[PDB]
């Protein structure tokens, strides 16, 4: 286990032949030395004799306690499950490295002495915020942007996959990325494509669910979000609809607007605190960009600012090609009449027409979609 | 030529490593056990020496003593209160009142005094570790550094120039300006160079859920700080911890003001903090309370303005000293193009223009690569700009 | 029975209370404002009656309360919300001071800096009797105050405290003390050992905290 990290010839050289035949000697000499221990000092099996000596030391009732401090000369103050805490001693088979204050431990039943530590069963909010599998199709599903698709790879993907281009330039990659535009133009859609591609752990939270009902519970949730993001890996934090922290007021929140503010001051810390940050990228998305605090959008916390426009009439035709790809489209229809139906129909409007027109076919058990399906589709989707 | 011959002779000796290390004992991937060849000290001896003679010694808390006799009154978590006695192994000196002690389960007598409770959310905000920001990175604001550095470290590094002259030097200092000016950055340079305990506090960590809970964390901060000889408290974004007392009608924002009053009491009056030096840093100081802006608490009032011209030229030389550039570019032309720009924007200009070199092919930036980054960062992101409603601090 | 001092925050209110703790040899007992605020109910109420029972025991004793507006905030009627628990500690402090079963053994010294916040039930006449105010120093006290804190410093006889009190208007006892410490540090910059008049005038510009913006185009 981690015996030798050197592989660098990568050929049929004598050096790769010599190095591993050196390691062949260090292994067998280690083997033949430790072989002579049980030959001259048998004295136990060592497979279970020292084990059953431990297993007869620690009792069959094994109470679970909780650390709260450590004094280094193998005794520490531990909390029982009731609340009455003790000052027991700590053993030597206890591998004194995984002991943090608050970690679950194993005590004795008689003298409550610290026998072992316990693996934590975590967590019912880490698994809430951690995206398990890749969501959907690739960047080829998007179509039409082609300018900001380059921009997001520039800040997130290319820093991860090619960490050579920045070093030869002697530079650090840009920190923050915000995505803004009219509603339904594909802000959330592009973040799915990043979650498709990347190898980093991907964390997602809506901006609406940052606000809480108890005092101080809001800023506590932000402090433990970036705790989780740092303690895994290179990671991506995606915050969606962050204008919703300020626009809507809810009566569940006990503090008024001056509790929203204290939540935003904690988030304003976590992006550009004085603590050593690490490898955590932040992606943010909104549609009301003029509402939120400009202290949060300054360079240093967010570097790249990406605007999404409404789809153009030659890029609209690309979108109809995408969402009507795998459907049995009857040749009655002409897509160009559907393009300029609304002068400013979003990309979300196109998928809303294409799905609803398919639902009109299943009312009549058909398999192909005719023209009058789309004729009564836009009456149903758009005009109400 | 010997393609398999190096390979299978590699593979079996990589296996023969594992095939005998399983015969030594590192295996049985545990649920909380040790390396098996490491616990042999307590294998036979201290298994029956740290366990069978040694006892549990349940820990308690002392109410008071009384005259003429030991007769100590003790207290535990939920159970009753007893009248106890010492052991022989400890003197009656360090069994002072209000002190946690360990106590046996049968006779209920005192074994050893204990360190007090630290309330572990205050334990995490000790920094323990230093950042890498040097004062060489805080260029452009030299006079602001010097007026700061004579308050924080020169009474600590030389406590004789002030004593023999006969002056008690100032104790507190706040740092205020527009955002992205270098306030939090300059505080990192202080923690780099110093030697005392550097206890940082972010003001959005004192808002608690119960009533009066936040005011106790202010005490436990200054309790452990008075134990230390010299200590340096850092307060960041204190417009959360208290603006002003303005109570009208329904009492709103009443709870945060009690935390702000407890902080004022720990800074002045009645056998003071002694050798504790505080350091606040706000973003808009017009909201702050007049009793907190009083000297004796916040003596120095360092301003972080925007750099003039030579402040800006020095910042370009910091954030672009370590990047592959054309030799013949001039920075003085660039600083004339950014009239009211923070130090945070000048870094983002330099990091953006390197990306233009990575856009096409090349390996070093040019002068026009900077100019393509200036109009994008300064004049195209100018809709946001973050500054002009913060110069007036509203 | 019961005195109250109030006024602007730099005028010296703790300073009398630390004076009287050094003069009378009685049981001096001090309190913070937000010390009487607890998470559990009734603990702040129990903590008040323990103090006036402990000062009941030491029959010569005076009790001091600093920053009384932490607990003494004016009551209010509100549905749906509002704190109540802090009112309980006040409503006993009303009663445990004055009302049923009075006594003349303890004296109360209370110090705030804002008065309109306070509930008028504790400014009645009998709970807090003598309401004295501490104004800002007029002119002659500013000459006297910075004379006091200039005692331990090597001051040359080139000083006109009547001038120095007159170029410092609108200061308080903290800011007049803050001039003496800053002038005692500017002389350490230039290596001087004695203090001159211009060291104080440069100390005033640091305590006022002016903003430096290129302004020499007047006159
Ligand atoms: N340019 C586009 N290309 C392909 N599909 C699109 C495009 N724009 C929108 N869509 C479709 O619209 C749907 C919604 O897009 P998305 O929610 O990402 O827009 P949005 O701007 O994030 O919405 P909101 O503003 O409500 O957050 C997506 O499922 C996507 O299939
Ligand atoms: N004078 C300067 N020289 C070099 N870099 C600077 C300077 N001023 C600011 N910076 C840059 O600004 C960033 C840190 O800004 P800082 O956090 O101090 O802003 P701030 O003044 O604290 O405002 P906020 O509280 O909003 O963050 C760093 O990336 C640093 O490179
Ligand atoms: N003669 C004086 N008059 C007023 N203030 C003084 C005088 N001498 C010293 N001081 C300063 O007044 C301060 C007392 O603080 P104080 O005004 O009581 O605070 P607060 O009133 O907010 O509790 C002391 O720090 C002291 O330096
Ligand atoms: Mg969306
Ligand atoms: Mg900052
Ligand atoms: Mg006071």
From Swiss-Prot, chain A:
Location of the region described as Disordered in the Swiss-Prot/TrEMBL record: 39-59
Signal peptide: none
Sites of N6-acetyllysine modification: 213
Keywords: Acetylation, ATP-binding, Cytoplasm, Deafness, Intellectual disability, Isopeptide bond, Lipoprotein, Membrane, Myristate, Nucleotide-binding, Nucleus, Phosphoprotein, Proteasome, Ubl conjugation
Cellular compartments per GO CC: cytosol; membrane; nucleoplasm; nucleus; proteasome accessory complex; proteasome complex; proteasome regulatory particle, base subcomplex
NAD among keywords: no
Positions with biased composition (Basic and acidic residues): 41-58
Main location: cytoplasm
Membrane protein topology class: Lipid-anchor
One Gene Ontology molecular-function label: proteasome-activating activity
Biological process annotations from GO: proteasome-mediated ubiquitin-dependent protein catabolic process
InterPro entries the record matches: 26S_Proteasome_ATPase, AAA+_ATPase, AAA_lid_3, ATPase_AAA_core, ATPase_AAA_CS, NA-bd_OB-fold, P-loop_NTPase, Prot_ATP_ID_OB_2nd
Annotated residues for binding of ATP: 181-188
List of residues that carry Phosphothreonine: 8
Organism superkingdom: Eukaryota
Compartment(s): Cytoplasm; Nucleus; Membrane
UniProt subunit comment: Component of the 19S proteasome regulatory particle complex. The 26S proteasome consists of a 20S core particle (CP) and two 19S regulatory subunits (RP). The regulatory particle is made of a lid composed of 9 subunits, a base containing 6 ATPases including PSMC1 and few additional components. Interacts with SCA7. Interacts with NGLY1. Interacts with PAAF1.
Annotated disorder: Birk-Aharoni syndrome: An autosomal recessive disorder characterized by failure to thrive, severe developmental delay, intellectual disability, spastic tetraplegia with central hypotonia, chorea, hearing loss, micropenis and undescended testes, as well as mild elevation of liver enzymes.
Alphabetized PANTHER family for the sequence: 26S PROTEASOME REGULATORY SUBUNIT
The protein's name in its UniProt record: 26S proteasome regulatory subunit 4
Gene behind this protein: PSMC1
UniProtKB/Swiss-Prot annotation, chain B:
Cross-referenced SMART domains: AAA (SM00382)
Binding-site residues for ATP, renumbered to this chain: 177-184
One Gene Ontology term of the molecular function aspect: ATP binding
Presence of the UniProt keyword ATP-binding in the record: yes
Cross-referenced PANTHER family: 26S PROTEASOME REGULATORY SUBUNIT
Subunit structure: Component of the 19S proteasome regulatory particle complex. The 26S proteasome consists of a 20S core particle (CP) and two 19S regulatory subunits (RP). The regulatory particle is made of a lid composed of 9 subunits, a base containing 6 ATPases including PSMC2 and few additional components. Interacts with NDC80/HEC; this interaction is detected only during M phase. Interacts and SQSTM1. Interacts with PAAF1. Directly interacts with TRIM5. (Microbial infection) Interacts with HIV-1 Tat.
Protein name per UniProt: 26S proteasome regulatory subunit 7
Organism expressing this protein natively: Homo sapiens
Taxonomic path: Eukaryota, Metazoa, Chordata, Craniata, Vertebrata
UniProtKB/Swiss-Prot annotation, chain C:
Signal peptide segment: none
Residues at which ATP binds: 7-14
UniProt modification remark: Sumoylated by UBE2I in response to MEKK1-mediated stimuli.
Disorder: Deafness, cataract, impaired intellectual development, and polyneuropathy: An autosomal recessive disease characterized by early onset of deafness, cataract, severe developmental delay, and severely impaired intellectual development. Patients later develop polyneuropathy of the lower extremities, associated with depigmentation of the hair in that area.
Function noted in UniProt: Component of the 26S proteasome, a multiprotein complex involved in the ATP-dependent degradation of ubiquitinated proteins. This complex plays a key role in the maintenance of protein homeostasis by removing misfolded or damaged proteins, which could impair cellular functions, and by removing proteins whose functions are no longer required. Therefore, the proteasome participates in numerous cellular processes, including cell cycle progression, apoptosis, or DNA damage repair.
The family this protein is said to belong to: Belongs to the AAA ATPase family.
Subunit structure: Component of the 19S proteasome regulatory particle complex. The 26S proteasome consists of a 20S core particle (CP) and two 19S regulatory subunits (RP). The regulatory particle is made of a lid composed of 9 subunits, a base containing 6 ATPases including PSMC3 and few additional components. Interacts with PAAF1.
Protein name listed in UniProt: 26S proteasome regulatory subunit 6A
Organism, scientific name: Homo sapiens (Human)
């Amino acid at each position: 286990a981690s015996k030798l990290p050197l592989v660098t010839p990568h050929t049929q050289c004598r050096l790769k032949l010599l190095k591993l035949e050196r390691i062949k000697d260090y292994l067998l000499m280690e083997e033949e030395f430790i072989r002579n221990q049980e030959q001259m000092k048998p004295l136990e099996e060592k497979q279970e004799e020292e084990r059953s000596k431990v297993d007869d030391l620690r009792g069959t009732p094994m109470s679970v306690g909780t650390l709260e401090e450590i004094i280094d000369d193998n005794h520490a103050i531990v909390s029982t499950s009731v609340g009455s805490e003790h000052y027991v001693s700590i053993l030597s088979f206890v591998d004194k490295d995984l002991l943090e204050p608050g970690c679950s431990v194993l005590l004795n039943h008689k003298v409550h002495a610290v026998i072992g530590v316990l693996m934590d069963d975590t967590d019912p909010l880490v698994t809430v915020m951690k995206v398990e599998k890749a969501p959907q199709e690739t960047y080829a599903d998007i179509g039409g942007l082609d300018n900001q698709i380059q921009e997001i790879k520039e800040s997130v993907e290319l820093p991860l996959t090619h960490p050579e281009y920045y070093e030869e330039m002697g530079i650090k990659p840009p920190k923050g990325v915000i995505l803004y535009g009219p509603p339904g133009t594909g802000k959330t859609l592009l973040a799915k494509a990043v979650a498709n591609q990347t190898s980093a752990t991907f964390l997602r939270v809506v901006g609406s669910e940052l606000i809480q009902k108890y005092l101080g519970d809001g800023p506590k949730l932000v402090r433990e979000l970036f705790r989780v993001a740092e303690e895994h890996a290179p990671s991506i934090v995606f915050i969606d609809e962050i204008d919703a922290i300020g626009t809507k007021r809810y009566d569940s929140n006990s503090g008024g607007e001056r509790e929203i503010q204290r939540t935003m001051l904690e988030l304003l810390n976590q992006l550009d605190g004085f603590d050593s940050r690490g490898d955590v990228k932040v992606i943010m998305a909104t549609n009301r960009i003029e509402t939120l605090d400009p202290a949060l959008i300054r360079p240093g916390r967010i570097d790249r600012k990406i605007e999404f426009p409404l789809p153009d009439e030659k890029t609209k035709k690309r979108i109809f090609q995408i969402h009507t790809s795998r459907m049995t489209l009857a040749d009655d229809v002409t897509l160009d009449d559907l393009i300029m139906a609304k002068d400013d129909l979003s990309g979300a409007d196109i998928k809303a027409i294409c799905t609803e027109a398919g639902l009109m076919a299943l009312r009549e058990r058909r398999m192909k979609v005719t023209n009058e399906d789309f004729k009564k589709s836009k009456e149903n989707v758009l005009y109400k | 030529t010997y393609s398999r011959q190096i390979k299978q002779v590699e593979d079996d000796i990589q296996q023969l490593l594992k095939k005998i290390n399983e015969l030594t004992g590192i295996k049985e991937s545990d649920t909380g056990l040790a390396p098996p060849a490491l616990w042999d000290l307590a294998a036979d001896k201290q298994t029956l020496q740290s366990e069978q003679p040694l006892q549990v010694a349940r820990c308690t808390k002392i109410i008071n003593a009384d005259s003429e006799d030991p007769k100590y009154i003790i207290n535990v978590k939920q159970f009753a209160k007893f009248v106890v006695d010492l052991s022989d192994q400890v003197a009656p000196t360090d069994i002072e009142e209000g002190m946690r002690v360990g106590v046996d389960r049968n006779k209920y007598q005192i074994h050893i005094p204990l360190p007090p409770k630290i309330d572990p959310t205050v334990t995490m905000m000790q920094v323990e570790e230093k950042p890498d920001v040097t004062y060489s990175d805080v260029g452009g604001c030299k006079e602001q550094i010097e007026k700061l550095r004579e308050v924080v470290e020169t009474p600590l590094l030389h406590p004789e120039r002030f004593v023999n002259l006969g002056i008690e030097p100032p104790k507190g200092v706040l740092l205020f300006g527009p955002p992205g000016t270098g306030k939090t950055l300059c505080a990192r340079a202080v923690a780099n160079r110093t030697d005392a305990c550097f206890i940082r506090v972010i003001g959005s960590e004192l808002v608690q859920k119960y009533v009066g809970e936040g005011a106790r964390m202010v005490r436990e901060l200054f309790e452990m700080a008075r134990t230390k000889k010299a200590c340096l408290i850092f307060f960041d974004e204190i417009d959360a911890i208290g603006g002003a007392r303005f109570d009208d009608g329904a009492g709103g924002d009443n709870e945060v003001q009690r935390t702000m009053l407890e902080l004022i009491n720990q800074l002045d009056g009645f056998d003071p903090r002694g050798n504790i030096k505080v350091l606040m840093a706000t973003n808009r100081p017009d909201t702050l309370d007049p009793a907190l802006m009083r000297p004796g608490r916040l003596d120095r009032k360092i301003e972080f303005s925007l750099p003039d011209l030579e402040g800006r030229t020095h910042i370009f030389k910091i954030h672009a000293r370590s990047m592959s550039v054309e030799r013949d570019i001039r920075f003085e032309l660039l600083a004339r193009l950014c009239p009211n720009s923070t130090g945070a924007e000048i870094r983002s200009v330099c990091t953006e223009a390197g990306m233009f070199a990575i856009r096409a092919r090349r390996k070093i930036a040019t002068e026009k690569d900077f100019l393509e980054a200036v109009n994008k960062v300064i004049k195209s992101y100018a809709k946001f700009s973050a500054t002009p409603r913060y110069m007036t601090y509203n | 029975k019961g005195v109250l001092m109030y006024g602007p925050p730099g005028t010296g209110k703790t300073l009398l209370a630390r004076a009287c703790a050094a003069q009378t040899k009685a049981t001096f007992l001090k309190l913070a404002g937000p010390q009487l605020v607890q998470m559990f109910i009734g603990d702040g109420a129990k903590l008040v009656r323990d103090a006036f029972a402990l000062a009941k025991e030491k029959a010569p004793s005076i009790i001091f309360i600093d920053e009384l507006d932490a607990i003494g905030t004016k009551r209010f009627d509100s549905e749906k919300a509002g704190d109540r628990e802090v009112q309980r500690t006040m409503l006993e402090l009303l009663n445990q001071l004055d009302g049923f079963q009075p006594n003349t053994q303890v004296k109360v010294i209370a110090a705030t800096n804002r008065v309109d916040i306070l509930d008028p039930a504790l400014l009645r006449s009998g709970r807090l009797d003598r309401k004295i105010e501490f104004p800002m120093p007029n002119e002659e006290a500013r000459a006297r105050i910075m004379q006091i804190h200039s005692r331990k410093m090597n001051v040359s006889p080139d000083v006109n405290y009547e001038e120095l009190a007159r170029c410092t208007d609108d200061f308080n006892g903290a800011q007049c003390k803050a001039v003496c410490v800053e002038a005692g540090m500017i002389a350490l910059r230039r290596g001087a050992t004695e203090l001159t008049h211009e060291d104080y005038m440069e100390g005033i510009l640091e305590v006022q905290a002016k903003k430096k913006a290129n302004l020499q185009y007047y006159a």
